[PDB]
């Protein structure tokens, strides 16, 4: 079963007391069966109470959404600087080679967050430079000479060295309150009217949900709704399936969906593979992540309230076709005649097991 | 010679009474010279009269092209369904997981659809997706297990299993009553537009790029219709008499998959090194690939019908090397002339005028 | 050293007294990390007074930048003809199968012209199809049979090879005084705040440098500038720095730059991997290229003036970042307390030693 990548297909890229940089396995090294999604790269950014990620860029476009907690993002620019309170939900772009700092700004909340990383320079790799300073090596900055860096600054190496260059005190440091209240002053936060927002971040359950009943909530931000997603062609959803109720079987027209299981436990059933079909059924917990394919179908059970973060790669003129309930049944959709064709029943047999779910997108399990 | 491609490399996928679905061998294993169309596919269908292929969706959007006969193509969305009278020339983009079936509504005439296909999660790879399934093979709802559908349709096992689950398949006969309910409300291709962003458009509702009495050019390019904009591409319809040639001419951009719909001819491709020639005698399913700037000339031994989709369409120019209209050599300034060519300016103008006709002559 | 490519890594494609033309070696070919530019090739063509590339096209997109000389560039559609007077800095866009001829003008300078090549058909291969039929080179009109070139120009084969199919005779041919001045007539000329033109040549120099001061003059024209350059995403920029100066410590947010050596002598430091950073640095000859990868910061320190021609692969929404001197210094932007926390030195002593650098973009060396 290819489709699941458990928890344990992270690779830990940076741990210590305060946080860790997990990296998914290439999704084509998996499996030659991903290898449209071999230039898609998924992180979890974790952190405790009061710490910040320092100054880093990487030569890819990241989207960021945050799972849980409340923290500061602020993104470099040349000449600007732009810093926003973010939230559960709170989703950006953050284009390749922008210098950002990520700060947990709670006294209590661990702060975690996904990244899609949509590399720039070699498919599928991701190189980030850090202008900090680490034990396996300090800044980027050391990279120059000493000459190019008197040059530069102009200043003697022996100041440069004492003031910019010289692993809890690493990539994850522990920050003040003092310091919080500091980079949290004029922090703009996501609103409605930043759910269209070309730089700022937008909240997923900003706009209302494309699907909402007692069983369940589908909420999806697509590039016809945000253009941060425009070049990139990505759509990112929220899926909260309720406690044993199931996501309605159905598939995605033209979108690839990377879905990581926030929160909850669950299962899921693929329909994959002259050839024949196949089911493809996993447990789905936290941190586990499911690649669905274009045009193969899918249910997903909850047995505890399961919360999913989709990216949709080919986003742009996705069609999610529902096969059981009233609305988005493509099946409910062929006519009277094909039905009788199609299926073994009559048509009025098949017309009559179609009404039986009355619940459409999510149902009881 | 690599840009040929002979019925014969058209492996059959599905054959009944009924009809026939051929896939044609990847282009990538013919050749690593064609490693740009390595996510381009070609299918025939062929169905008999009062015939319909069942619903089914595949992860590759479609370019379909009616080469012979009369259809209704019905089309659904999640919430919604059109169908459409498709005559010969017809043109139309099926999305990619957008479930179709398709009829053959003439009494008589056999149906033969061209299908340009384009994979959306692996380079090259047809997943079909079939709700009737073929005895051995069954509707892929048999994925999901008994617990998922008792849930999903809230209905006993049992009788989903004997309504959707468990003569002939996949291709199978229509009665004249079931064409009627079909051709309800079925919309046709406008017969003066081709720039319709869902309908069918046919190739010939305008007039033709180039016409004289030896050969008609058509060419629907993303310019003119909206459907034909993302996947950069043009359909054309060239349509070469009896003992005439298509004049030698090259694209500028764009890749050309071209298909011999019906008749005989032979083609002259120039390609690479000094250059080559590449020869061969083209029949009724056979292809033929033109690679930007690969000069051909296409001459009709009988009158020939090939059908053309030109990947990286947006901004091609076909320059023709004869004839008067769209001669690129003749453009070559006066002294450039004596320069590039052994002859001078005026014997070189004077041979360039001996081919009064444009795009078609006599062979 | 796998970021510089020598004029040793030319390849002369045709040559005689008249002119050559050169192919730089593949760039996946040299190193796998450049597997993202695989379908981009530069050619340096170089001509003496007097002369003319003979009529050909290319299954490649060109962009071609006047590095020297003058010339009348003649463009070919099906029915029609347009030629240019170039001169130094004229950039114009050569689609893929268009037929074009290039004429140095001049009584006396050698013209210099630096091409990208975009291949439309195998990715990074170059097919060129030669319209002369001189000496040698046998004309492509030649792959067609007697039957079929009897048949489309209606004439006997006999004529046809007279006078169209059958060394400084061969591909660059000498052109008299009054063929240029025939040339010459209907040649029109490139603007002055030009850059916009749809097909015309534009001047890297038409528009005002993004960045200038004593020590350097940078120049860049972009898809939002010049449209020909939209659908390629490319920038071309000219970068002038001055004897014993140097272009400050910078990266582009996505860019990938091709940095061809016009004229000068002098270094460059590239900051990689190869993981903990590494230096890469190696002197910069005329003829010689240095690839930046996206991320990559550069400073290029100049012994003589040094002239650098650079395309910028990803243009869209590229920013360079400084990381030295006033405008356009990222480090600067830094909040405070995170260049506190991200720098050995106090905030104060860092904000300090970014005010010594009192240039921005270009300083002495």
Redesign the interface.
Known sequence: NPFIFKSNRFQTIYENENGHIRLLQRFDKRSK?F??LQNYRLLEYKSKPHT?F??Q???A?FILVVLSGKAIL?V??????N?FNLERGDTIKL?????A?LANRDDNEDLRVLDLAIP????GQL?S?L???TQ??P???????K??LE?????EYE??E?????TNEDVI?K?SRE?IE??SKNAKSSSKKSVSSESEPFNLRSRNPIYSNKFGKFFEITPEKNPQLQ?LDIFVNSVEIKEGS?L??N????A?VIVTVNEGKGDF???????????Y?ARLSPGDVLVI?????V?I?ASSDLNLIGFGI?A??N???????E?????S??????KE?????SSR??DR??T????SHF???
């Open positions: 069966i290898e449209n910040i320092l100054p860029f990487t030569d476009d602020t470099l620019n040349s000449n600007d600087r810093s284009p390749a080679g922008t210098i700092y720039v320079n070699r498919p190189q430079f202008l900090s300073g396996n090596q800044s980027f900055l050391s990279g120059f000479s000459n190019i040059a530069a600054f102009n200043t100041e440069i004492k003031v910019l260059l010289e440091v920050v310091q500091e980079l070049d199931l309605l079987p598939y995605n027209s033209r690839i059933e693929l329909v994959g593979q002259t050839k024949q079909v196949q089911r059924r394919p274009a045009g193969h179908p249910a059970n080919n742009k003129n069609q999610r076709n529902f096969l059981a309930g609305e988005d049944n493509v099946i959709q062929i006519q009277r005649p094909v064709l199609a299926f073994p029943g047999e098949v097991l179609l039986n779910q009355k619940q149902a009881n399990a």
